[PDB]
Amino acid sequence: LIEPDGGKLVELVVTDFERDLKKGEALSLPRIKLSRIDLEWVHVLSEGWATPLKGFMREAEFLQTLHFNSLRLDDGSVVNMSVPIVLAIDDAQKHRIGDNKKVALFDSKGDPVAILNNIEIYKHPKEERIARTWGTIAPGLPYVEQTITNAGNWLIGGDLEVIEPIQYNDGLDHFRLSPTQLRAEFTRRNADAVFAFQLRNPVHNGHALLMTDTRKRLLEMGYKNPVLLLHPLGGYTKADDVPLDWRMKQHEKVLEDGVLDPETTVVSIFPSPMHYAGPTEVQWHAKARINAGANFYIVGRDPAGMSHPVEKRDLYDADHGKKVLSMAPGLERLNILPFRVAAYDKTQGKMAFFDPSRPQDFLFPDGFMCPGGWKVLVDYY
Amino acid sequence: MLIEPDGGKLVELVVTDFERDLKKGEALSLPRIKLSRIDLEWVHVLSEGWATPLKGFMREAEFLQTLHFNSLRLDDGSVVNMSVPIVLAIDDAQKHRIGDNKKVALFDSKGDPVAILNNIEIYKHPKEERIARTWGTIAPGLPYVEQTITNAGNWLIGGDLEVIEPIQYNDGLDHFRLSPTQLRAEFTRRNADAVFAFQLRNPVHNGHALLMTDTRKRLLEMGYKNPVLLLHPLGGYTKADDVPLDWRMKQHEKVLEDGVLDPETTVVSIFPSPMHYAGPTEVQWHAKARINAGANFYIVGRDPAGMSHPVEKRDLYDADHGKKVLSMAPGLERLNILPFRVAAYDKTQGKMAFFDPSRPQDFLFISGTKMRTLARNKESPPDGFMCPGGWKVLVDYYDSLV
Ligand SMILES: Nc1ncnc2c1ncn2[C@@H]1O[C@H](COP(=O)(O)OS(=O)(=O)O)[C@@H](O)[C@H]1O
Ligand SMILES: Nc1ncnc2c1ncn2[C@@H]1O[C@H](COP(=O)(O)OS(=O)(=O)O)[C@@H](O)[C@H]1O
């Protein structure tokens, strides 16, 4: 099975039992209250989705991420790191911490979630951080409006100890498998290959085509036990799009109508918030999937893309995600599976790859989505 | 020995004498692109191996690596620094005229064939995304951007560049335009054991001099017996309100003449790159080109390659980021970075010295605008901020603008 970055998973949840010891130690330190998205990053960090990141990003790590989309290690080593994972902090909170080297991170219930050790506070260069991550500045960037635009002229990083595994209690916690649980589950099936499929949307037959086509390629490649890791992203997503709970139902119906084989598919939820930062973000979608133990990564067109909040176009070129991914630092050992655009073929009755020689044949609808999956979606709506 | 050009060997793109005549003829047959002043500067940069091991104008693959990773991957799987796009933009017409030719000729202004671009590929030119990832911002009034990007074509052409003749301007400064090979040959003649480079775009004041003389001191203390300063003013495109290259050279020559810097242990040469004004991103490029010139030490201060935000007034960049970003940049690890903090005029010592935050009221900051204001007002900066000869050249430059 493919090894995590650095050689081992770096999980940051304290042992059983220092949880009481750490709950108590937290009572003597200053307090920062997490917002919803902060806690999701804590959740991300805890399970080791950003291995070997030892906590919220210090200044040198933040800069490395912005400029190079990578992190250097104790050897000359470079791993992929394409998104700032940062805790923002306002003026009153900075003073309130003063000269403390340990701060405590509390959830909105008022309980101690985590201890941040050996902290450093530094400036929050908002415009530049945004320009370097999204490749634009325009207002209306959903992730930017949350957690960046409005609050925090400082950042605080350091080594993080997470007290208790994060549970949202929304009724979906049984889907949120850790990287090491997924590795427990792939090794459970004697999987000789794991192909991941990142998605933020409901599955249609185009997405299925990419997945079904990947199977045969791996069987034709010699693999006896290929496993599809279907991975809806379940962190923050824009209010517009279809919420996680409905998508999970939709996927349940897709897996039901045989369009995807449940016998060889693991469904799990990726805890990370969505950046909507195109080629920059897709590297992170891939980075995590490596740490989750997937050695093949499916990428289609315009991954993690969206329309420009102002102008009449897409933020990004649709082919760049593929291209950038296939040369991204620390992602070389990952097997990339690039695909072209799938749309509805009118000559045939199904989804098929777009044929530039006969554009008149494609619509962008019977066979476009499995009618079971369309029930969830027509209900929800 | 001197530090290696990265990839191993310098990669020059100038054809040999033998093939020279042949190439011009082959060039006159090809579809042709007329080079802007800045395009020609990049051709110069490419020709002499300043961007070694880059084989010409960037292909789409090389363009993306530059924007996202600030590095190029080599065929052995190693990387080298590459933080600024070196590209060639063309419009719908030019594209259409090129058609399906795989070879195109680059012509100067006016009429002369300067290069052939081989095995070309034309790809989309995403200007906004390009400006954001390179400059850290989008804002009207970024000078390099306004000069070659915002009015440029929606396409880029890359390929293998063959430069027919070594570029000369014949402006009375060609004797200072040393190639990296020529620079390496001069360092070796001096038996230098340490080559410390000072990139600059501005007139030399005594703050810059402090950086350079402290460096020589550190190097001597480290054990080096013949440390050599590469005083290396940038000479390609700069914004027009800046002091032009020819005045800066006269100013630099006065600084060496007054003994502020030592003419015997200094090489003075002009760096032919255009100026990006892109701080932490651009500064990597300033360093990478210097490795290729054989400098194994690189001096860097506060806000390298920076400028004020054009629209609002704060700096474009955090002044400490250049040093940091340089110290961890891919492919620059083998270069010795020599970081400095702010130098400023110390009223209490009557000298340029390193800024002391515990007594900030002691320090005077003198900007280019202030210098121009003083000159108009018939006054001078404090005694010791700039050597008299250098300052005199500047008052003459200010007077010429009248
Ligand atoms: N019509 C399509 N044709 C080919 N690939 C697609 C198509 N739509 C989405 N994809 C790919 O399917 C994967 C999932 O994308 P989405 O769920 O729509 O959003 S994304 O943010 O996760 O990229 C991505 O790899 C994307 O590139
Ligand atoms: N007052 C200063 N104190 C310390 N370093 C400085 C100072 N002014 C400029 N520098 C440094 O001197 C070098 C050249 O500066 P400039 O000529 O103004 O512009 S630059 O584009 O070449 O960086 C850079 O390393 C810069 O950081």
Side-chain angles (χ1 to χ4, degrees):
Chain A
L1 193 38
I2 182 193
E3 312 200 298
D5 289 325
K8 286 303 167 191
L9 263 187
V10 176
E11 263 195 288
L12 297 172
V13 174
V14 295
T15 210
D16 276 2
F17 217 62
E18 301 173 284
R19 172 162 91 215
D20 272 354
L21 179 92
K22 298 296 169 169
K23 273 164 175 174
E25 174 182 334
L27 306 181
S28 290
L29 312 171
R31 306 181 176 184
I32 290 81
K33 195 176 73 142
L34 273 46
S35 64
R36 176 96 182 243
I37 304 203
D38 296 318
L39 174 54
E40 296 169 358
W41 287 120
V42 171
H43 189 195
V44 163
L45 289 170
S46 59
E47 305 179 355
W49 294 95
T51 299
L53 192 47
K54 278 147 55 187
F56 283 109
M57 287 183 175
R58 304 184 142 105
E59 188 175 46
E61 288 164 335
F62 178 73
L63 287 170
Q64 267 175 83
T65 294
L66 291 175
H67 291 95
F68 314 133
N69 293 171
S70 75
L71 290 195
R72 297 184 77 180
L73 307 188
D74 266 88
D75 18 325
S77 287
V78 146
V79 305
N80 193 259
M81 196 79 260
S82 64
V83 290
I85 306 184
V86 288
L87 195 43
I89 277 308
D90 89 323
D91 288 280
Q93 290 175 285
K94 172 170 166 60
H95 258 264
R96 187 161 52 83
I97 293 164
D99 290 34
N100 293 289
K101 302 190 189 206
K102 295 197 204 312
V103 285
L105 314 185
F106 280 62
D107 57 35
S108 278
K109 323 208 69 179
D111 310 294
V113 301
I115 294 177
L116 199 62
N117 310 274
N118 300 128
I119 66 148
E120 56 167 79
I121 295 172
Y122 58 110
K123 298 209 234 96
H124 187 186
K126 288 172 173 179
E127 200 198 28
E128 178 184 358
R129 177 206 172 166
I130 294 158
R132 294 197 197 280
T133 293
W134 283 269
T136 183
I137 276 307
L141 299 187
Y143 184 88
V144 172
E145 311 285 42
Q146 208 106 348
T147 83
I148 298 178
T149 289
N150 258 8
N153 286 338
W154 304 94
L155 298 181
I156 182 186
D159 314 306
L160 189 67
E161 302 169 297
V162 185
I163 287 161
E164 234 157 357
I166 286 77
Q167 296 163 350
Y168 296 64
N169 291 314
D170 45 9
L172 292 168
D173 289 294
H174 60 288
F175 282 129
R176 303 186 170 92
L177 264 79
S178 82
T180 136
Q181 271 171 325
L182 291 172
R183 280 158 180 278
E185 170 78 356
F186 298 138
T187 205
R188 219 212 88 217
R189 301 163 169 251
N190 311 77
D192 51 6
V194 189
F195 64 109
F197 183 75
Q198 143 76 28
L199 69 153
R200 81 177 195 239
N201 280 308
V203 184
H204 60 47
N205 292 342
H207 309 128
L209 172 55
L210 274 60
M211 277 174 281
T212 66
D213 240 66
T214 298
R215 265 258 134 73
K216 352 190 128 72
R217 195 102 44 181
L218 292 169
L219 298 168
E220 262 148 55
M221 233 177 278
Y223 291 96
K224 343 288 313 305
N225 250 273
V227 176
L228 163 58
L229 172 58
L230 190 65
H231 229 164
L233 177 144
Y236 167 88
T237 52
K238 94 185 77 163
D240 180 341
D241 301 356
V242 180
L244 176 66
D245 59 346
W246 293 102
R247 288 186 285 115
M248 292 300 300
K249 296 189 239 230
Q250 203 265 357
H251 303 354
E252 253 196 21
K253 237 111 197 78
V254 172
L255 205 62
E256 266 289 288
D257 297 9
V259 199
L260 292 192
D261 188 7
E263 299 260 304
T264 49
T265 302
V266 175
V267 181
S268 181
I269 293 179
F270 186 49
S272 171
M274 185 81 191
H275 277 269
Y276 305 94
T280 296
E281 194 182 1
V282 77
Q283 301 175 61
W284 156 246
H285 290 172
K287 157 86 177 324
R289 272 41 180 251
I290 291 182
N291 285 333
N295 62 332
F296 289 84
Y297 185 97
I298 299 177
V299 57
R301 113 259 115 122
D302 194 29
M306 59 163 291
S307 169
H308 194 297
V310 165
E311 299 203 307
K312 258 188 287 251
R313 43 88 157 188
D314 292 327
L315 269 91
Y316 312 109
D317 191 317
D319 288 337
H320 285 185
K322 278 155 44 172
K323 281 172 187 168
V324 168
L325 213 58
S326 86
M327 30 196 193
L331 300 185
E332 316 83 6
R333 33 177 229 128
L334 182 55
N335 292 307
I336 307 310
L337 295 180
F339 284 88
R340 306 173 313 206
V341 188
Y344 193 87
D345 198 331
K346 279 143 93 172
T347 72
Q348 300 164 112
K350 68 172 106 98
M351 300 294 275
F353 299 111
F354 180 67
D355 195 1
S357 56
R358 43 189 194 97
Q360 61 285 11
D361 288 346
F362 294 83
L363 195 152
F364 287 87
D366 206 275
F368 168 62
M369 176 169 299
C370 67
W374 181 250
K375 296 163 181 300
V376 185
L377 216 44
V378 74
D379 273 320
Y380 155 66
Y381 200 82
Chain B
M1 311 292 286
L2 290 87
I3 183 177
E4 266 148 335
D6 55 23
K9 314 306 176 91
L10 276 182
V11 179
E12 292 187 76
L13 304 178
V14 178
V15 314
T16 61
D17 287 28
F18 285 58
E19 319 164 322
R20 189 146 300 183
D21 254 324
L22 305 172
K23 283 308 178 179
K24 295 187 186 188
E26 171 189 319
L28 294 158
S29 303
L30 299 173
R32 41 191 174 210
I33 294 296
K34 212 179 65 172
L35 298 181
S36 73
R37 175 128 158 109
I38 285 172
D39 294 331
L40 180 62
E41 292 173 2
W42 289 115
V43 170
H44 196 184
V45 170
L46 291 164
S47 72
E48 296 187 324
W50 292 99
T52 285
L54 190 55
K55 284 176 285 183
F57 284 112
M58 287 176 186
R59 302 192 138 83
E60 178 159 61
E62 288 157 333
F63 181 60
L64 300 163
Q65 289 176 71
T66 298
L67 294 165
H68 293 281
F69 317 131
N70 286 172
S71 64
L72 278 183
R73 186 107 48 96
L74 297 191
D75 289 321
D76 85 272
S78 51
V79 318
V80 293
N81 191 263
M82 192 68 273
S83 66
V84 288
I86 302 173
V87 288
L88 186 55
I90 45 130
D91 59 28
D92 279 8
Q94 282 163 313
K95 179 205 182 74
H96 191 281
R97 194 163 49 85
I98 293 172
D100 280 273
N101 291 274
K102 301 159 74 278
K103 275 171 159 49
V104 298
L106 303 182
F107 265 49
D108 68 23
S109 73
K110 271 87 169 293
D112 287 22
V114 311
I116 293 154
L117 193 60
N118 295 285
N119 312 98
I120 68 129
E121 59 174 76
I122 287 156
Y123 57 101
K124 293 196 260 188
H125 179 200
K127 311 212 258 202
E128 171 152 297
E129 173 169 15
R130 177 192 167 186
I131 296 156
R133 298 197 195 273
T134 288
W135 274 274
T137 185
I138 300 302
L142 300 165
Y144 185 93
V145 179
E146 287 298 329
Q147 192 72 23
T148 45
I149 304 175
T150 133
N151 291 330
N154 295 356
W155 306 89
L156 298 174
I157 341 112
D160 315 84
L161 192 69
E162 281 179 307
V163 184
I164 298 178
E165 232 111 44
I167 290 91
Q168 309 163 329
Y169 305 98
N170 307 101
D171 55 347
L173 292 171
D174 279 340
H175 66 282
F176 281 120
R177 290 186 174 99
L178 270 70
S179 74
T181 306
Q182 296 168 323
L183 283 175
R184 277 164 186 269
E186 159 73 9
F187 300 144
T188 204
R189 280 183 295 190
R190 290 185 181 248
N191 305 105
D193 28 322
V195 181
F196 65 103
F198 189 76
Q199 144 77 35
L200 70 165
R201 69 175 204 246
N202 280 322
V204 170
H205 62 52
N206 291 336
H208 311 119
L210 177 51
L211 269 42
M212 291 179 262
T213 61
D214 251 31
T215 292
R216 166 150 286 123
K217 260 46 242 174
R218 200 152 331 198
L219 286 176
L220 287 183
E221 298 193 57
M222 277 179 273
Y224 295 100
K225 309 179 73 63
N226 196 19
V228 174
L229 166 60
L230 174 63
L231 187 67
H232 215 182
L234 179 141
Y237 170 79
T238 45
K239 62 217 193 86
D241 87 282
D242 275 7
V243 184
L245 174 74
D246 63 346
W247 279 99
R248 284 187 283 123
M249 294 307 279
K250 285 146 156 177
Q251 197 266 355
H252 294 356
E253 170 185 274
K254 247 51 195 175
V255 167
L256 291 146
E257 188 170 320
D258 284 352
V260 178
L261 292 179
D262 192 349
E264 279 161 75
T265 53
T266 295
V267 170
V268 181
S269 169
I270 304 180
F271 179 50
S273 196
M275 182 82 193
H276 288 260
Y277 309 89
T281 305
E282 187 181 1
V283 77
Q284 298 172 64
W285 161 238
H286 288 175
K288 151 109 169 348
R290 267 61 174 232
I291 289 174
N292 285 331
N296 59 341
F297 288 83
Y298 187 90
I299 290 171
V300 61
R302 60 111 194 90
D303 202 16
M307 65 178 293
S308 178
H309 205 281
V311 155
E312 62 216 34
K313 260 178 234 183
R314 61 165 168 89
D315 288 347
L316 224 38
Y317 310 103
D318 185 308
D320 289 306
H321 282 180
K323 304 180 290 185
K324 291 194 174 59
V325 164
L326 220 46
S327 75
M328 47 201 187
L332 297 187
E333 320 85 348
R334 64 206 190 82
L335 176 57
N336 303 117
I337 312 303
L338 304 181
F340 290 88
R341 36 205 234 286
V342 180
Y345 188 82
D346 189 341
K347 284 156 67 180
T348 73
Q349 297 305 132
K351 280 170 152 157
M352 296 297 286
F354 293 122
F355 180 74
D356 181 5
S358 70
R359 50 190 195 94
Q361 71 278 5
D362 282 4
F363 289 95
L364 236 55
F365 295 83
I366 311 283
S367 70
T369 299
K370 183 65 161 33
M371 283 183 258
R372 188 176 112 248
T373 294
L374 292 165
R376 187 200 107 108
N377 288 343
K378 285 305 209 300
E379 14 188 43
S380 295
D383 200 277
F385 167 81
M386 186 180 295
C387 74
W391 175 241
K392 211 204 216 143
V393 161
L394 292 190
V395 324
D396 285 347
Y397 157 66
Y398 293 124
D399 288 9
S400 76
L401 305 175
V402 188

